[PDB]
Amino acid sequence: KHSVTQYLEEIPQQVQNRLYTSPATCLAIYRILPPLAKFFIMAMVFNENEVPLLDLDKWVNSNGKLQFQNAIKSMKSLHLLIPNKSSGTLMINLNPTFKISLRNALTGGEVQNSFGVVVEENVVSLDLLDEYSANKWETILHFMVGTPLAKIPSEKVLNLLKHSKLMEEVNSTGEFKITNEGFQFLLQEINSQLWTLLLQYLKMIETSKMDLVDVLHFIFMLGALEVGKAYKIDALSETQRIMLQDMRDYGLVFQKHSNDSIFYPTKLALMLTSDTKTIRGLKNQDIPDGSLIVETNFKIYSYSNSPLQIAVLSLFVHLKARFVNMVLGQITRESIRRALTNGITADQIIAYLETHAHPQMRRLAEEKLEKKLELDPNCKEPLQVLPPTVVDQIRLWQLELDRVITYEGSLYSDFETSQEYNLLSKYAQDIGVLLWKDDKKKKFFISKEGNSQVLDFAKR
Amino acid sequence: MGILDEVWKHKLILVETPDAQETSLALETYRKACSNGRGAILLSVARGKVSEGIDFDHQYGRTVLMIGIPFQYTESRILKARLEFMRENYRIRENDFLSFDAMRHAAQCLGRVLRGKDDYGVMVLADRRFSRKRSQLPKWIAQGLSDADLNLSTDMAISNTKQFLRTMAQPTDPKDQEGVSVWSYEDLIKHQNSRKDQ
Amino acid sequence: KKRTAKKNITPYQRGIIRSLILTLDCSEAMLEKDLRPNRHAMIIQYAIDFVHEFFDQNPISQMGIIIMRNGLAQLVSQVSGNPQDHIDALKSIRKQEPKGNPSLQNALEMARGLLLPVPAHCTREVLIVFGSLSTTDPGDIHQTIDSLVSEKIRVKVLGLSAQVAICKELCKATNYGDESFYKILLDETHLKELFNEAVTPLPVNKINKGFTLVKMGFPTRIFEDTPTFCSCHSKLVYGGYFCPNCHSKVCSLPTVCPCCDLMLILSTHLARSYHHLMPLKTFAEVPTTEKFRSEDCFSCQSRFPILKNHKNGKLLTSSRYRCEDCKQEFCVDCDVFIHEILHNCPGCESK
Amino acid sequence: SPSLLTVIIEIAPKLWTTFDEEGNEKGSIIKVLEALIVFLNAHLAFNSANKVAVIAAYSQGIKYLYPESTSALDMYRRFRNVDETLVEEIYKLFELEKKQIEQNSQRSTLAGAMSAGLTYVNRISKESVTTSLKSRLLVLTCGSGSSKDEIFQYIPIMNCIFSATKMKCPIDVVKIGGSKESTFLQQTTDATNGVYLHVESTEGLIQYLATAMFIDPSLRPIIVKPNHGSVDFRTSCYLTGRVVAVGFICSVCLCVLSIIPPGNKCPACDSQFDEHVIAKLKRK
Amino acid sequence: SLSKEKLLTNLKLQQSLLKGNKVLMKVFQETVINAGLPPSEFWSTRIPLLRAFALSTSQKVGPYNVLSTIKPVASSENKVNVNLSREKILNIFENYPIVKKAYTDNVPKNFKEPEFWARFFSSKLFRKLRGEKIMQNDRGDVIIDRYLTLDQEFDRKDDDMLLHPVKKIIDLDGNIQDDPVVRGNRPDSDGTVDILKGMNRLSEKMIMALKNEYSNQQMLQQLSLVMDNLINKLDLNQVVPNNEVSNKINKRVITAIKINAKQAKHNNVEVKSTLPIDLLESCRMLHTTCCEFLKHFYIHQKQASTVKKLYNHLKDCIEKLNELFQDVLNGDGESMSNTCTAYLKPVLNSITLATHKYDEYFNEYNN
Ligand SMILES: [Zn+2]
Ligand SMILES: [Zn+2]
Ligand SMILES: [Zn+2]
Ligand SMILES: [Zn+2]
């Protein structure tokens, strides 16, 4: 995941404030920050005066300081605030545009942008054009992955996929195949897929007539809530209107026909930020249609099905004869070796199975779950909540094809005496952060938690 | 065989022996053990003295058995002669009379295991020939003996009796269905049948 | 078609204080295969549940646990008022496996010895979870039963799948004759509810007995943290309570002061008692066609009332089970919840 | 982790006048109402769209405000619907006021309010088995005079406490009125792991609210903000009325009595005592 | 069986319990070997432990199964001392005198461990249990055969000693034939009848060994309506909702709250001299039990002299701890002495208060 939040902080500060002028964008980005930062920001928003950092330290206690650093580093990186070495101290305060926009949003501000929606006869039916948006999303997914017939006419969308290198397909020969990007597209279920596509449209649509402030205004206004009336008609910039038409083509806009009307708020824009339920001629009833198969016997038992879904399953398992409720497929080392040929790591698939194919594995994941977390301290043996056997077999296939070991962290030095090194090693063993250590070299390559805690203890 | 070892491990055995005094002693110890904790088994003879007068109440009897069906002609022909007289003097054939006597003794044995209606208890039999005699039995025994309970194997027998014992153990005391089969004090008889004077 | 208790006819007295001495059964019988793991494992699990529950609802009582292995009664938890000790003891047992025959007589005698110190106002009790179909006594039993009833010691037992004559005699004997306490089970859920109904105090129709005022005092929490110091376990504990009279620290509990020996409570225990003393009238199920009342809930706001003429559906019933004194409706969920968890009737509170 | 903050605002027009009587009449409850609306919106925004609920307590009963029982049969705009609906309901309730409303001043239905709110929490939690709701309610009370401590509601409050603890529902309370520490409420917040706030009258709470009435959803690593000590030296003697320390509690009655036993028939349950036991007590 | 004075005088039992717990023997000796407490009252506190122990002890197992079993359920382990060896043999002895007598008689010679029990298998386990061996292995020799002969008439005389005049409901004897003098027939082969008599006799012996018993209104509505209006009067400017208004007021609120956070934070939910720590712990336990005995006695009451002895001892203990604190301050210095004083403050206060209370009561009684 490119972690669009990282792209957000990527952009410079002045354009960040340019975006913060739009209160709805302020709210939407408030939705994204880690909870610690959320709470701290909500504290600061009202008392119109900077605050010393010492208070914001003493606010948090023990065994939870890691999140303090997470929040402060994130917020500084995206520069929502302005640290102030006023008297040599730290006089924190938000980018005041952010503060005022947010406060306006909380109590009836002047955000005509966020208020761009119009209330009228929302003749849009729940299934009404919702099925059409779902069908468009399925069509583009199939065309990108490659179906027997790809009716994907998104010439702009195809150009974005190709130039963006969305999938390892020979666009010169017209191929739309799964690359590392294609593997990720197979991985990111909904939010991941929509996010990758939005980032691709951003990167491709970045040359001329961008108006990035208007771009994000339109995007978040779409994700915020149903603008409905007068959206497409009134509430859009010129380039904003063009981007809206393009998104509506991309499915992310459920604009009605007649090419001129209010905004058509498809559920997809909601899906962009919701991180919630995923379900979308005139028939389609399934809260658990996807009937995948995955047990301890490493077999594929399917009753429920979805053609693109089962094709995704086939992307790492053989197909011989499609059946009524089943499809001939058995997951083996060869089955995942198919994706290993694409170099697909046995990592995304883990959480994928934990999440996807569950419409047919609800009872399976419940019996594996068994609520064996509160019962874990008492009964020390887990009831295969997340199947470890399958994980071990997958790791074995991955190991069979790999043979290389790597570690994260950074090399450390200036352990002048053996006493500091030994005490830090003991503390790390207490906290389980030392990958490896040696007093002879006074060096190691681990996470920064031990150094952080020692420095905090020393300075304060 | 070792068969007796197991029943020893569970309950008590109290055999029936020809001398009457020792028999009485054994029988009373059987009662004393039943009302005590340890379960106790008394095995006796249908023709024998035990079945004649001794009673078997709630505790003292749960599951009678009838290993085989009692018949006499094991021994000599005095029965043959009397039966000859029977056939010539009364229009009764041999096997008819023999079956009649056998079921007489069988019913006499079986009836002992109940005293009131609060009491209860299994009453098994055991022989191939029993299945056709189901009509020879006294009526009130026959009623409880439904058709589906015929020539059962031992295994289904144990299943059924287990279910019985459990079910009867329940305090199934609606006390309003007992106004049907108890005709309570001075009234339900009075009311019901003083009206039934029809 | 209803399954309700008609009326409660001892809503005047219960044994609020208790000293219940649960006695399990760990003997070769409990190893048969009728309950899912066995008799024994399921038994101990439910025993843990019952321990938690009972020490909740009767938070002023004590309890002791007794097993019956190899014909011996081996105390596995002194009579004590701290649930955690008993919980741990049961934990320990559950990993150990039964043997020998259940010696009901020995367990009974050990209990009768055990409950001697319990004072007059406190009430005694035992709860035999008898599993087998026999006993093995080293003495007369009716002797013991007579001694028991002489010492005013009610006993309730929960047989497994049978009825044993002596146990029936036992329950009928100690409980002032009135036989209702030998309930035996026929299903696991029946077993859960068996323990549940064992939790509550136990009235039948109490003989007029001595009723006695009991001295006790309430503590006040402590403040300091580093001054950690304890007078009931002789440790350092970052802060606890003070006996109002003995005036010595005591680790958190409703326990008895370990210095001047008077009972300690806050009040919430007394509040639980109050809840048990004077419960509500059982909520009535309103007539199907004669109600003509509001179409909602009252405590909650549910939309489950009727359907208005639907051949058989409306002919079924009208979910309006409505309490008497406040005479306000309540959907089934609300009535179940009121009569189970919180006993302040919503409407009957308000007037 | 969604949370169901179910405020319980009591509004006694008697106590409302007392609030006008207290200090100056420099502003009616209107301040409190507006601050409550804002705080409610704040919570409604904070989490991932987690519901709310509000109940009142007028002089002659209680009635819901937000969930808006079936009647017909800006900013995110759901804020809009919640707030406008609440205010319409509350104005409707204010129409429900007259002399017959002035009549039944005998009681104060706060206990009914808390109990019903807890029932509501149970309803919502039970229906929404999926995505278990870490719910927690609130209490806003206009602290008035004319009753130093009404006690006829003592028990139902504690029953509320026990229900709360079993249901795992912290219950925070904000008393606005005279410097009279609402003892039962104080024990309620302290026992059920809450927070007590005895503000002065006329300050715009919104700061107090958003500070110390927003940290109870599903956090609890954070020091609560409770006032001075919460002494559990509980109820005064039923007979006497003076707070007891070394209590003397009868029996099955359970009433707590002072060092003054009437010698017989504890004055809440007709139970004559063993005069021998009386002497044993008198042995001091 | 268990009495307060009985457990008080059960000196061997008390010393056994001393052996029971190291903590127990330690506290007892330091309450005794330190010229402290007579054991009598020391146990007078601990009586329930004694009762429990005693009951846990004298617990005769049942006869019954294992008793029987010792003839049936025990036919395999032909090796050395089998399961419950001593237990099984004592069950045998109580179950059957003959084997006990034979084994005793065959102690000075002929070991009854291996060869004794080997020949016993044949002899007894044919005599009792199964059918008459008669032929086959007739190893029932010497003591075995002698005891066989004995046990015959012995069981006979036992059975004789068993005959009650059974109550006339069951009296099969008087029931059979002892009404009439009749002439029947009879037709329904020795041995095994003895087997049946054997099982009857065993059971009855068992049972008998068990019977053995061994402004308001107006202005109210006015203000209410005023507020109702104000609400209805548009208003409700959530912008105007305080925010914090007076920055000063805001600050003051924050001050209050940070003050309270600090104070409640002061609740951080490790001694130096481990040997002195343990010693002080011993002193605390000592003073605790000493005060325990007083606060028992000073409440309860005619054993005034016992209270006097307790009080004198307690005053001695108080002075002892005072000297302890003096020595601690001298040696460990101040910080360690401060920690010791903190650790002992509660108990010290309690004992001092007890002393003062006794002084007050003594003055009251005297004056
Ligand atoms: Zn302690
Ligand atoms: Zn005390
Ligand atoms: Zn309801
Ligand atoms: Zn009611």
Concatenated DSSP letters of B8-65: HHHSEEEE--SSHHHHHHHHHHHHHHHHSSS-EEEE--TTSHHHHH----TTT-S-B-
DSSP string, A262-323: S----HHHHHHHH------------SS-------TT-----SS--HHHHHHHHTTS--S-B-
Cα–Cα distances (Å) from D263 to C215, D205, D236, D237, in that order, read 15, 52, 19, 15
> For A444, how many CA atoms within 13 A lie in the half-sphere containing its CB?
21
Minimal Cα–Cα distance from E215 to chain D, Å? 7
In degrees and rounded to multiples of 5, residue C242 shows phi and psi of -130, 125
| Coil, strand or helix at E38 | coil
D188 with D171: CB under 8 angstroms?
A: yes
Residues of C in contact with D271 (CB under 8 A): 211
Amino acid identity for residue A83 in this structure: P
* Residue in E closest to C114 by C-alpha: E52
Tell me which residues have their CB within 5 A of the ion that is ligand 3: C 297, 300, 302, 331, 334
Cβ count within 10 A of residue D106: 9
In degrees and rounded to multiples of 5, residue E140 shows phi and psi of -55, 80
Cβ count within 10 A of residue E338: 13
For CA atoms D94, D95, D96, D98, give the dihedral sign: positive
Report the DSSP pairing between strands D173-177 and D196-199: parallel
Buried b (16+ CB within 10 A) or exposed e, E214-237: eeeeeebbebbbbbbebbbeeebe
Q: Alpha-carbon distance C90 to C68, whole Å?
A: 14
| Coil, strand or helix at D30 | helix
| Coil, strand or helix at E233 | coil
Q: Alpha-carbon distance D185 to D114, whole Å?
A: 11
Q: Alpha-carbon distance C327 to B68, whole Å?
A: 68
> A95: Cβ–Cβ under 8 A, 6 or more apart, which residues?
A13, A16, A17, A20, A79, A80, A81, A82
Q: Alpha-carbon distance A442 to A183, whole Å?
A: 42
> If you count them, how many residues does chain E have?
367
A187 with A312: CB under 8 angstroms?
A: no
**According to CATH, what is the number of the domain B1-176?**
3.40.50.300
**Per-residue DSSP letter, A22:** S
Cα–Cα distances (Å) from A320 to A298, A310, A333, B8, in that order, read 17, 13, 17, 65
Q: Based on the number of CB atoms within 10 Å of its own CB, is B196 exposed (0-12), middle (13-18) or buried (19 or more)?
A: exposed
E212: tokens are 């053995």
Chain-centre distance for alpha carbon C18: 9
Minimal Cα–Cα distance from D209 to chain C, Å? 27
* Closest by Cα among E58, E53, E47 to E7: E47
Q: Which residues pair with C216 in a beta bridge?
A: C263
Q: H or E element: which one contains A214?
A: helix A212-224
* Closest by Cα among A1, A64, A61 to A32: A1
In degrees and rounded to multiples of 5, residue B43 shows phi and psi of -115, 125
Q: Alpha-carbon distance C91 to C49, whole Å?
A: 12
C28 with C101: CB under 8 angstroms?
A: yes
> For A205, how many CA atoms within 13 A lie in the half-sphere containing its CB?
23
Distance D93 CA to ligand 3 centre (A): 22
Vertex A42 angle, CA A36 and A48, to 5°: 130
Mutate to test the interface with D, among C122, C269, C350, C351 (most CBs of D within 10 A): C350
- Does B39 reach chain C within 8 Å, measured CB to CB? yes
C75 with C113: CB under 8 angstroms?
A: no
End-to-end C-alpha distance for chain A, whole angstroms: 37
Q: Based on the number of CB atoms within 10 Å of its own CB, is B60 exposed (0-12), middle (13-18) or buried (19 or more)?
A: buried
C166: tokens are 């002596």
> If you count them, how many residues does chain B have?
198
Q: H or E element: which one contains E53?
A: helix E39-57
CB contact under 8 A, D119 and C245: no
Q: Alpha-carbon distance A338 to A357, whole Å?
A: 19
* Closest by Cα among D170, D190, D62 to D121: D170
B185: tokens are 């004090």
Vertex D111 angle, CA D109 and D112, to 5°: 65
A134: tokens are 């779902």
**Tokens 């016992």, located at residue:** E306
- Torsion angle, alpha carbons of A345, A349, A351, A356, to 10: 160
Q: Alpha-carbon distance E131 to B132, whole Å?
A: 40
D18 with E219: CB under 8 angstroms?
A: no
> If you count them, how many residues does chain A have?
460
Q: Alpha-carbon distance E325 to E320, whole Å?
A: 9
Q: Alpha-carbon distance E261 to E173, whole Å?
A: 93
Vertex A98 angle, CA A17 and A38, to 5°: 125
| Coil, strand or helix at E94 | helix
Q: Alpha-carbon distance E287 to E347, whole Å?
A: 8
> E144: Cβ–Cβ under 8 A, 6 or more apart, which residues?
E102, E119, E120, E122, E123, E124
- Torsion angle, alpha carbons of A96, A98, A101, A102, to 10: -120
- Contacts by residues B182-189 (CB-CB < 8 Å, ≥ 24 positions apart): B182/B117
Least CB–CB distance from C248: residue in E59, E268, E346: E346
CB contact under 8 A, E230 and D87: no
> E22: Cβ–Cβ under 8 A, 6 or more apart, which residues?
none
**Tokens 């393009």, located at residue:** A246
Q: Alpha-carbon distance E201 to D27, whole Å?
A: 101
**Tokens 């809009």, located at residue:** D80
- Does C175 reach chain B within 8 Å, measured CB to CB? no
Cα–Cα distances (Å) from A53 to A49, A70, A233, in that order, read 13, 15, 47
Cβ count within 10 A of residue C235: 11
**Per-residue DSSP letter, E61:** P
Q: Alpha-carbon distance C24 to A415, whole Å?
A: 61
Buried b (16+ CB within 10 A) or exposed e, D260-278: ebeeeebeeeeeebeeebe
Least CB–CB distance from E243: residue in A46, A55, A108: A46
| Coil, strand or helix at A94 | strand
* Closest by Cα among C290, C291, C281 to C326: C281
**Per-residue DSSP letter, C285:** P
Q: Alpha-carbon distance E308 to C313, whole Å?
A: 85
A421 with A436: CB under 8 angstroms?
A: no
Distance E329 CA to ligand 1 centre (A): 27
C99 with C27: CB under 8 angstroms?
A: yes
For CA atoms A126, A131, A136, A137, give the dihedral sign: positive
Least CB–CB distance from E56: residue in C75, C139, C259: C75
Tell me which residues have their CB within 5 A of the ion that is ligand 2: C 243, 246, 257, 259-260
* Closest by Cα among C330, C315, C318, C314 to C280: C330
C141: tokens are 């039993």
Q: H or E element: which one contains D6?
A: strand D5-8
C139 with E210: CB under 8 angstroms?
A: yes
Residues of E in contact with C247 (CB under 8 A): 349-350, 353
End-to-end C-alpha distance for chain D, whole angstroms: 58
Q: Alpha-carbon distance E72 to E347, whole Å?
A: 64
Q: Alpha-carbon distance A313 to A325, whole Å?
A: 15
For CA atoms E307, E308, E313, E319, give the dihedral sign: positive
A244: tokens are 């809206």
Q: Which domains does chain D have, with CATH numbers?
A: 3-213 (3.40.50.410)
Cα–Cα distances (Å) from B138 to B71, B100, B141, D232, E227, in that order, read 18, 11, 6, 77, 91
* Closest by Cα among A249, A254, A306 to A279: A306
Residues of B in contact with E196 (CB under 8 A): 15, 17
- State this model's resolution in angstroms: 8.2
Vertex A449 angle, CA A445 and A452, to 5°: 110
> D227: Cβ–Cβ under 8 A, 6 or more apart, which residues?
D181, D196, D197, D198, E260
Size of interface B-C (CB pairs under 8 A): 32
- Neighbouring chains of B at 3+ CB pairs under 8 Å are C, E
C133 with C29: CB under 8 angstroms?
A: yes
Residues of C in contact with D61 (CB under 8 A): 350
Report the DSSP pairing between strands D140-143 and D173-177: parallel
Q: Alpha-carbon distance C27 to C132, whole Å?
A: 8
Buried b (16+ CB within 10 A) or exposed e, C272-304: bbbbbbeebebbebbeeeebeeeeebbbbbbee
Q: Based on the number of CB atoms within 10 Å of its own CB, is C315 exposed (0-12), middle (13-18) or buried (19 or more)?
A: exposed
Q: Classify the phi-psi angles of A54: left when phi > 0, otherwise alpha if psi is within -120 to 50, otherwise beta.
A: alpha
**Tokens 């019903």, located at residue:** D116
* Closest by Cα among C80, C131, C123, C83 to C107: C131
E46 with E8: CB under 8 angstroms?
A: no
A335 with A317: CB under 8 angstroms?
A: yes
**Tokens 């309860």, located at residue:** E300
Q: Alpha-carbon distance B13 to B43, whole Å?
A: 8
E259: tokens are 């003050």
Q: Alpha-carbon distance D189 to D175, whole Å?
A: 12
Distance C299 CA to ligand 4 centre (A): 10
CB contact under 8 A, E227 and D29: yes
CB contact under 8 A, B169 and C183: no
For CA atoms D19, D25, D30, D36, give the dihedral sign: negative
DSSP string, chain B: --HHHHHHHHSEEEE--SSHHHHHHHHHHHHHHHHSSS-EEEE--TTSHHHHH----TTT-S-B--BS----TTS-THHHHHHHHHHHHSS--HHHHHHHHHHHHHHHHHGGG-SSSS----B--B-SGGGGGGGTS-HHHHHHS-GGGSS--HHHHHHHHHHHHHHHHS----SSSHHHHS--TTTHHHHHHHHTT-
* Closest by Cα among D199, A39, D202 to E245: D202
Q: Based on the number of CB atoms within 10 Å of its own CB, is E335 exposed (0-12), middle (13-18) or buried (19 or more)?
A: exposed
C249: tokens are 């620290």
Least CB–CB distance from E62: residue in C137, C225, C246: C137
* Closest by Cα among B137, B61, B67 to B99: B137
Q: Alpha-carbon distance E346 to E348, whole Å?
A: 5
A253: tokens are 């806009």
Cα–Cα distances (Å) from E299 to A444, C171, E291, E307, in that order, read 68, 41, 12, 10
Least CB–CB distance from A61: residue in D38, D74, D221: D221
- Does B9 reach chain E within 8 Å, measured CB to CB? yes
